[PDB]
Design a protein around this ligand. Structure first.
Ligand SMILES: *[C@@H]1O[C@H](CO[C@@H]2O[C@@H](C)[C@@H](O)[C@@H](O)[C@@H]2O)[C@@H](O[C@@H]2O[C@H](CO)[C@@H](O[C@@H]3O[C@H](CO[C@H]4O[C@H](CO)[C@@H](O)[C@H](O)[C@@H]4O)[C@@H](O)[C@H](O[C@H]4O[C@H](CO)[C@@H](O)[C@H](O)[C@@H]4O)[C@@H]3O)[C@H](O)[C@H]2NC(C)=O)[C@H](O)[C@H]1NC(C)=O
Ligand SMILES: *[C@@H]1O[C@H](CO)[C@@H](O[C@@H]2O[C@H](CO)[C@@H](O)[C@H](O)[C@H]2NC(C)=O)[C@H](O)[C@H]1NC(C)=O
Ligand SMILES: *C(=O)CCCCCCCCCCCCCCC
Ligand SMILES: *[C@@H]1O[C@H](CO)[C@@H](O)[C@H](O)[C@H]1NC(C)=O
Ligand SMILES: CCCCCCCC(=O)O
Ligand code: NA
Lengths: 16, 263, 99
């Protein structure tokens, strides 16, 4: 899945 | 000059419940950051390692990378389990400054296997075919795709511009070479040692008067521990032929006055 | 694939007997990154060796710099000894001021 990284990028999309 | 900015991540997985990820950041040949596995925060190795970014902007980038690091680790150990140890993964991400181009390359077991290019992750020709499935899944995540595109297209060159301003003193420093001669039926290897110079570009040649000795064999650039360089150049000579030889060194720091040592 | 470390040992300043200096051991071209590096004085481990951060080159192979304060003499020998999974035996390179 790469489950966590995908969850990371979804949460820290808004900051960038 | 055209600087290469690179963020280098090194992840080792020994088994389930043992891995570490350590990172270093380089601007040209000067280290700007280290981020140890056991450190929660990214450590500055220069006064100017924050570039022109604010405390607030930097703090959140740190936190973002902290979540990336934990996320990355969990996903690889999952990826391995869902399919042997030990596993080594390396990422080289950054930008080359002219305008600029960005890159994000990944190696598995010492070999380049994946890049981010344009808008998507891509396996390189010759990579193991088992990568195709997880890369397709990773590409389904538009959040990460957009986040990586922003980091490479915008954030990297922007950050590097600030680093160049804030680090000008160190980046443009000049340190002088100091040189010395030594030597190891009949044949002799003469060694011209040159140490403590910065920046890296240097010219070293064995000479007989104004004639360059084409046997001059330059070694590799070797780092000193004080952000200066070491280089040696050797010349194999027959007995007696030693007389009249000199080592000449040219370097930007010397103000046009070459070092010449006479054997 | 495993890659065998290369070792180069060199002084920071021109060697002068009885004068404090720094001895460098630069280890390159190895994989995986786990490695043990010792610097030796007359065969005995030098205790206070400082290591740079592990890094890697454009070709993906790892490198690291060890260094220590040393005062060369006519009679002391100095070496750098490396243990790595690529080699059955530890590899030792001696410092030679002439080289
Ligand atoms: C960030 O910049 C990206 C480009 O920069 C490169 O990659 C980044 C990560 C850095 O490393 C940098 O150093 C690199 O130089 C940029 O990526 C580009 O995104 C666009 C839009 O998605 C892509 O355009 C689409 O191209 C395809 C065809 O692609 C093939 O041909 C081209 C050349 O013709 C090759 O270069 C490619 O490698 C492929 O072989 C078209 O079919 C497609 O057309 C369709 O979609 C458009 C809408 O986008 C419609 O108008 C049309 O009707 C079609 O339906 C696009 O034109 C572009 O390929 C891609 N570049 C690369 C090299 O892949 C990215 O968008 C930037 N992101 C941000 C957030 O700024
Ligand atoms: C590298 O860092 C990770 C993350 O900090 C370490 O994993 C933690 O180790 C502690 C120490 O026992 C555990 O209690 C935590 O549950 C772990 N945290 C996470 C997020 O998994 C890891 O042990 C470090 N690796 C090495 C070799 O030191
Ligand atoms: C989620 O998006 C994390 C993806 C991991 C790869 C991102 C690497 C991009 C590096 C570009 C340079 C930005 C400057 C960072 C300062 C240390
Ligand atoms: C996992 O790897 C670590 C690091 O080499 C080692 O100390 C530990 O014994 C290993 N544990 C198992 C169960 O394999
Ligand atoms: C072995 C290939 C690993 C590619 C992982 C890409 C990094 C990420 O998930 O952001
Ligand atoms: Na790290």
């Amino acid at each position: 899945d790469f489950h966590h990284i995908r969850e990371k990028g979804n949460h820290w999309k808004n900051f960038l | 000059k055209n600087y290469t900015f690179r963020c280098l991540q090194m992840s080792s997985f020994a088994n389930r419940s043992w891995s570490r990820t350590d990172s270093v950041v380089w601007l040209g040949d000067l280290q700007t950051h280290r981020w140890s596995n056991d450190s929660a925060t990214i450590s500055f190795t220069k006064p100017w390692s924050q570039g022109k970014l604010s405390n607030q902007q930097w703090e959140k980038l740190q936190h973002m990378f902290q979540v990336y690091r934990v996320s990355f680790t969990r996903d690889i150990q999952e990826l391995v389990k869902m399919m042997d140890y030990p596993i080594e993964i390396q990422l080289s991400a950054g930008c080359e400054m002219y305008a600029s181009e960005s890159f994000l390359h990944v190696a598995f077991q010492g070999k380049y296997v994946v890049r981010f290019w344009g808008t998507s992750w891509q396996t390189v020709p010759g990579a193991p075919s088992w990568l195709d499935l997880p890369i397709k899944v990773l590409n389904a995540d538009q959040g990460t795709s957009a986040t990586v595109q922003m980091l490479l297209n915008d954030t990297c060159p922007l950050f590097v511009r600030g680093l160049l301003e804030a680090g000008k003193s160190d980046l443009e420093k000049q340190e002088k070479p100091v040189a010395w001669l030594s030597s190891v039926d009949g044949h002799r290897q003469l060694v011209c040692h040159v140490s403590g110079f910065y920046p890296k570009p240097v010219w070293v040649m064995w000479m007989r008067g104004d004639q360059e000795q084409q046997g001059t064999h330059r070694g590799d650039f070797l780092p000193n521990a004080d952000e200066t360089w070491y280089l040696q150049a050797t010349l194999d000579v027959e007995a007696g032929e030693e007389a009249g030889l000199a080592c000449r060194v040219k370097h930007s720091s010397l103000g046009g006055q070459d070092i010449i040592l006479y054997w | 694939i495993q890659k065998t470390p290369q070792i180069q040992v060199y002084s920071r300043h021109p060697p002068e007997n009885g004068k404090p200096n720094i001895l460098n051991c630069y280890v390159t071209q190895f994989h995986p990154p786990h490695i043990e590096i010792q610097m030796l004085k007359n065969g005995k481990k030098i205790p206070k060796v400082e290591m740079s951060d592990m890094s890697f080159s454009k070709d993906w192979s790892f490198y690291i710099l060890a260094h220590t304060e040393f005062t060369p003499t006519e009679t002391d020998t100095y070496a750098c000894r490396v243990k790595h999974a690529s080699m059955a035996e530890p590899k030792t390179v001696y410092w030679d001021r002439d080289m």
